[PDB]
Structures are given as structure tokens and as C-alpha cells.
């Protein structure tokens, strides 16, 4: 029983799937859902924005990582661990990693329209929740994300 992991995977999977398919999921989010929905709304707003201005860089990275299929996620996990290896953790880095995950997911859908986004979403969620567990907990998890990116 791991609610933070469950919640994180739901948020990230939903974002990746929407981005990949172009369609929103009309199914009530699990327990919580209030924070999750606001997190997903935040992720749409800021994640789309990251993808903007950085299309060239993202394409560059996709190409260099040569991600061949829905299951080829080991290299991305390594890259994410490497990003955090200077010892710095913040929501800008996290949203950028998730946004890049959505970028990859979109591209995998073009090559194969039957591609599952779950391996990618699981790989990203694993890095975030497992390696930043206490950092997330201290901050009431996704509330930290919501408030950091909150605009009036």
C-alpha cells in the first residue's frame, strides 16, 4: 500500500496518455483526485509550456537516445538519475522530465499507434517517488507542485 506512488503514477500516466492520444480521460480519478486533478491541470499548463521553446532540444535528445520502443526506458531512467546527481531537486526539473516523457510518448505513438505509455510513466514515477520520497513527503507531495506553479 503506497498512496504517494499510486497517486504519482496516476497523474503522470494520465498526462502521458492524453499527450500521446490527444484525448482527455473521462473517468473519475481515484482517492484524492482533487489534488490530482489540479496537478494534472498544472501539468497540462506548464508541461505544454516546457515543450514550447524546447522543441528543438527535445527532438535532439529523442534522436540521440534512439528510443526504439515502448519498453526501451532504461536509458531515460539513467538520464533522469544523472540529472539529479548534482544533488539538486526542484519542481522545474521534475516537470521538465515529465514533459520530456510526454514528448517521447507522442513520438512512440506515431511510429506505433498501439504503443503503451505505461512503461515510460512507470519509469519516471519510479525515479521520482523512490529516489525523492522524503523530499516529496515533506511537501505534502503534489501540493508542492500545485503551489509552486500556481498562477493568479
Amino acid at each position: 500500500s503506497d498512496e504517494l506512488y499510486r497517486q504519482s503514477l496516476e497523474i503522470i500516466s494520465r498526462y502521458l496518455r492524453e499527450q500521446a492520444t490527444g484525448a482527455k480521460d473521462t473517468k473519475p480519478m481515484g482517492r484524492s483526485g482533487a489534488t490530482s486533478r489540479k496537478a494534472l491541470e498544472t501539468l497540462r499548463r506548464v508541461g505544454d509550456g516546457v515543450q514550447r521553446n524546447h522543441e528543438t532540444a527535445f527532438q535532439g535528445m529523442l534522436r540521440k537516445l534512439d528510443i526504439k520502443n515502448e519498453d526501451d526506458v532504461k536509458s531515460l531512467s539513467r538520464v533522469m538519475i544523472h540529472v539529479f546527481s548534482d544533488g539538486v531537486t526542484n519542481w522545474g526539473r521534475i516537470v521538465t522530465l515529465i514533459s520530456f516523457g510526454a514528448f517521447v510518448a507522442k513520438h512512440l505513438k506515431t511510429i506505433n499507434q498501439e504503443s503503451c505509455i505505461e512503461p515510460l510513466a512507470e519509469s519516471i514515477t519510479d525515479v521520482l517517488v523512490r529516489t525523492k520520497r522524503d523530499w516529496l513527503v515533506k511537501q505534502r507531495g503534489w501540493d508542492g507542485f500545485v503551489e509552486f506553479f500556481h498562477v493568479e
Binding site: 516546457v50 538520464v79 540529472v83 539538486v88 522545474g92 526539473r93 521538465t96
Partner: peptide, 22 residues
Amino acid sequence: RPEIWAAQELRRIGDEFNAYYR
């Protein structure tokens, strides 16, 4: 290595976005 370069790139963008929202 492509993996080191990708990490450098994602970190640059990540910190930029962090600094943006403060």
C-alpha cells in the same frame, strides 16, 4: 555520450523553468 548530453540539456531546461516560477 548522448546520455550525459541529454541530462545536461534536461537539467538546463529544468533549472530555467524552476527559476522562472521562482
